[PDB]
Assembly symmetry: D2
């Protein structure tokens, strides 16, 4: 019970659990969806609903919002957290994988925001938080689909903020750095030199450590709450100082 | 003769000949494409090739680069200038329109950059200039597809700059304000109060006038030239001061 | 509460929203202000007040030393004091310009360094600079403010990089038009108060002025361990103002 | 040329690239610099040289007055002089901090105003400030530079808004690491010159230092009528440095 007591919260990509747990801890009714079935454990662990959903599919996006709305009784908050990547520069990425990344990372958040918004009207407003990335504000080598899709999500965040202000819905984004999620910890483990990749990714931040999912969750939680009542259209880095430097924030040269 | 003497330049959406005439006057061999057949007049007027092309279609994009490359003998410069919009917020825009805007404004530049890049290798490098918009850096009400697609193009510009640097290809964007295109001039002319509409749009800029297409062309020209040899990944506003203010640059408080 | 037992310094705390917000979460608050009214704020919340001119480097040193002594510890510094010198570069006098830079830019740098040495004693802390959207963009005839605030924005980044090893996070909030007494008075002494209010409301997508309490919440969050992985960030608290390339609350 | 007959002022023109570039396009160039070697630049290009300390407001006034008189007209001002003071906010001395803010921030403001009064006489002109990527981002131990340059960036916006009605465009270039004699000297005085060079080259996607001539071209363009609808813009000349969230020329 507390800051989101009784409120209905939708989380796309809730399988990690940090975001879902954070809202649940504050008394929210959480509906999460994920492609991976493990998300069921997260929902059971927190007294929330789970839906196995492929956000690539527009019919499935409609079904998720409808069924989650029905399960929760209301929609107050949407968190768009699901994302994919297609490794490669524009030279090497295949068009189908590019279009899949745009569909999931950019088109799905737009669509879900519209669907969730129609529900939020019924309760007088709400908040949307899009989990972008520092990779929506800057790029890196060989990650074109991610960079383009996330860059679009950043300006989409602004679009939605302007358009949904009349419905009393705030829309913001968080732009995480390197976060110690299982995916990032496996990427490290599968890299040519895991030990050096760990040190190199820690050192992308001024704080010289990976971010924790809980730390992203707190930012999302804040932006979704009434504590952030005069904040809409904002893109908040949660990157331990990464984007404060023009080089490696945790290793100047 | 000139800064582009002998060089092969591709211009997407060149029906407004400003960009093509600018390159042509500096001695370029210009291949332009456009959906509208009027672009033929532009090509004839400047001694260049014209291709009627629908950039929405990936097969047509491949055919354009292949045939333009063959016609010109070389590719040195690509200018991605074609764009469309689908009026509406996320609440009102139809998914097919949204996907068509993303295809044309975001996917097409990515694809065309890759194709053009393989040609530029043959001549030891070159330059790409994407025409984004101030609407890729900020949003406005009821223009979600444009804002999202252009936002993506801005970060894609960065991605391409990083990835294409090793090929000695610079990639930049120009971000125009309100430009006196025939579409813009007509909207003014058909508005209930043309003098008010004009004054409002002029006053989005500190210079309190619409930009001319020729002014955008000069920015594109500069960024594509060796005069800009240490400039890559940059997004240059051509907006007479619009993005320098947090409100109307030409109409304070 | 979230700052129970912690020592919090607020420059320009005479308004009171920020001070009240930290106090409400159990903080020991030391505020300073040029205006003596800040005493009421401190009394109202069980905190210490110091009448201080932040323009003067000796007074800045004395404030941190005496506030540190009064509170027993320093965990948080909020740099909120600011002034302006109306005019473009053409009309602003150099002495006024230099006074605005001293107060808005130099004072925050200096105070951050002083506060930082005291935060080491308690294992870290947080600094929040109250910049403005006027540090990210400009407006006509406000050059000193725009320049000083622009500097504070990048100084926020500098401090974040340098103070990270000391476990001190440094962020800024960039408010839009806030219904402070200064702002409410400007409206009131306007030839058309209703029009001025409507125009400034409409700078924001939410089409209202921000409340000082709303800025306070942002400052509170950024100063707390809930922003543990947030440093070097500039957070707009501007109801969507900077999300548009024109008036966010009145498109054309 | 693009500046045939036009009067161009260049502050800290001693390096010479910018001066040469304008001269090559037919400009009458007046440059100033603290270092007497700018006389060789002025002699080499048929321009005037003034030995000037831009820290001093009286000297700034005298420069514009005398350069204006020598040239007959002022069309363009390029503010290129800058200094730095080593250290974070913890270690920088306040006197050194204030001197950087005076030369890097106050001097361009002042010089812009002075030059602007001259440009009115010929119906307008252009100002280009040489800021830095270090005005948009920071690095460790360079607080004065980061703050001053950050201020110059937003000042560039302020001036653009205020000087638009006078038909004067104001823009900035934001250079990366440029192979000036100071930068190369630092590489040489480094414990590992080869490593330092490789590191600084790799701050750019193009994986080399910029040349002063390359900055000059950007300045030249922004000052010309080819850039007629460009004002208030900040143009990186950084070979892709600010396009990445890490080292643009060395990803991890
Ligand atoms: N199409 C899809 N449908 C549902 N969940 C998806 C999904 N694509 C990815 N996810 C989930 O979303 C999470 C990945 S996103 C991870 C954080 C951040 N948004 C990022 O961009 O990296 C995982 O839990 C993953 O399984
Ligand atoms: N699919 C397509 N194929 C080819 N040309 C296209 C196109 N879609 C649009 N264009 C052309 O691109 C131009 C419009 S874009 C105009 C400039 C800027 N990109 C903007 O968005 O405002 C016109 O010449 C138009 O006919
Ligand atoms: N030199 C100085 N010393 C101490 N307090 C000062 C001061 N100059 C201004 N103040 C105080 O600082 C406060 C400014 S608060 C107003 C908002 C401000 N523009 C910002 O966003 O930072 C006021 O209470 C004022 O009286
Ligand atoms: N106070 C001053 N008066 C005049 N010239 C100065 C000066 N301080 C520095 N200069 C000169 O102006 C140039 C500045 S060197 C550094 C400039 C670079 N664009 C940067 O932003 O770091 C040099 O030629 C230097 O000798």
């Amino acid at each position: 019970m507390g800051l989101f007591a009784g409120k209905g919260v939708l989380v796309t990509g809730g399988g990690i659990g940090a975001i879902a747990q954070a809202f649940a801890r504050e008394g929210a009714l959480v509906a999460l969806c994920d492609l991976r079935p493990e998300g069921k454990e997260v929902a059971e662990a927190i007294g929330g609903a789970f839906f196995q959903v492929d956000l690539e599919d527009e019919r499935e996006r409609v079904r998720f919002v409808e069924e989650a709305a029905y399960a929760l009784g209301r929609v107050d908050v949407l968190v768009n957290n699901a994302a994919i990547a297609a490794p490669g520069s524009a030279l090497t990425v295949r068009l189908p994988e590019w279009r899949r990344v745009l569909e999931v990372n950019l088109t799905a958040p737009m669509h879900l925001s519209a669907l969730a918004a129609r529900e939020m009207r019924k309760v007088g407003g709400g908040a949307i938080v899009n989990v972008a990335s520092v990779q929506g504000l800057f790029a890196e080598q060989e990650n074109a689909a991610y960079n383009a899709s996330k860059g679009g999500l950043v300006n989409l965040t602004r679009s939605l903020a302007l358009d949904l202000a009349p419905l009393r819905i705030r829309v913001n984004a968080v732009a995480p750095g390197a976060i110690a999620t299982e995916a990032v910890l496996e990427a490290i483990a599968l890299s040519p030199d895991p030990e050096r990749t760990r040190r190199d990714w820690e050192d992308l931040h001024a704080l010289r450590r990976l971010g924790k999912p809980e730390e992203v969750a707190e930012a999302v939680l804040f932006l979704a709450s009434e504590k952030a009542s005069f904040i809409t259209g904002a893109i908040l880095p949660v990157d331990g100082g990464m984007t404060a430097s023009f080089m490696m924030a945790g290793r100047p040269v």
